[PDB]
Ligand binder design. Structure first.
Ligand SMILES: Cc1nc(Nc2ncc(C(=O)Nc3c(C)cccc3Cl)s2)cc(N2CCN(CCO)CC2)n1
Length: 244
């Protein structure tokens, strides 16, 4: 039903953090990314099934799967501009602040949807987002859960207390990364000293390109008390409001 005939794929080039992925052509027309296993065959297939059951404008769009033979493939839309972190660096001289805001908005819409479906991302960060030829940012729904020190809240670092609210903290850091055009958070510190200082209440300082209004949004994501952080729904509203 989601099954694709592998005969209609043409492999064009190998493309890290997104696994074993190649650029291809589907039915001579459609640019695709084609994923193969690097995980057991069983869990790769169950990942594909998670993807079959999730759908949003800001999740990388599943086109189909090949599971009736080996090797197993997962097929999605090709995101031509690659990973967000490298894209921020590539285009750093060009961005206008409205664009930075739309990128935050894109990822925030994906996360509101995933929150609503009781999935946690668990590595929400610029390196793990993809960008299409239109500049639209999307998130992967492969490998979701139902600890990157610089993107984790204290309750995760200390207690492995993962929740919507821990993805909220990471989304704040991702906002900081976007507004800093891909700089490393807490550059001054080792991972260990980062974990240390954050529990002591260290927060990321306002990037050059973030207005006070925008900073207020990312900063709300980092409340010590998880229950004082906003939901992705509230975040999107705040982001939309600051947009006009
Ligand atoms: C690593 C990488 N991927 C790119 N595009 C992708 N589109 C969709 C991808 C993907 O992984 N789908 C997927 C699958 C298949 C299964 C489960 C889950 C998912 Cl999300 S990977 C582009 C790219 N480029 C290198 C540098 N460039 C400079 C141009 O500005 C050209 C672009 N590099």
């Amino acid at each position: 039903s989601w099954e694709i005939d592998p005969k209609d794929l043409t492999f064009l080039k190998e493309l890290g953090q997104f696994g074993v992925v190649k650029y291809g052509k589907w039915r001579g027309q459609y640019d695709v990314a084609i994923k193969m296993i690097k995980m057991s065959e069983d869990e790769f297939i169950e990942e594909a099934k998670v993807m079959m059951n999730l759908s949003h404008e800001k999740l990388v769009q599943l086109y189909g799967v090949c599971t009736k033979q080996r090797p197993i493939f997962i097929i999605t839309e090709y995101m031509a501009n690659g990973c967000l972190l490298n894209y921020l660096r590539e285009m750093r001289h060009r961005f206008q602040t409205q664009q930075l805001l739309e990128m935050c908005k894109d990822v925030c819409e994906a996360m509101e949807y995933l929150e609503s479906k009781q999935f946690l991302h668990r590595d929400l960060a610029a390196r793990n987002c993809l960008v299409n030829d239109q500049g639209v940012v999307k998130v992967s729904d492969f490998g979701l859960s139902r600890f990157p020190v610089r993107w984790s809240p204290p309750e995760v670092l200390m207690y492995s207390k993962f929740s919507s609210k821990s993805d909220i903290w990471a989304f704040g850091v991702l906002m900081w990364e976007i507004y800093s055009l891909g700089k490393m958070p807490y550059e001054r510190f080792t991972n260990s000293e980062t974990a240390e200082h954050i529990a002591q209440g260290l927060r990321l300082y306002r990037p050059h390109l973030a207005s006070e209004k925008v900073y207020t949004i990312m900063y709300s994501c980092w409340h010590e008390k998880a229950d004082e952080r906003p939901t992705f729904k509230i975040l999107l509203s705040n982001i939309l409001d600051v947009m006009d």
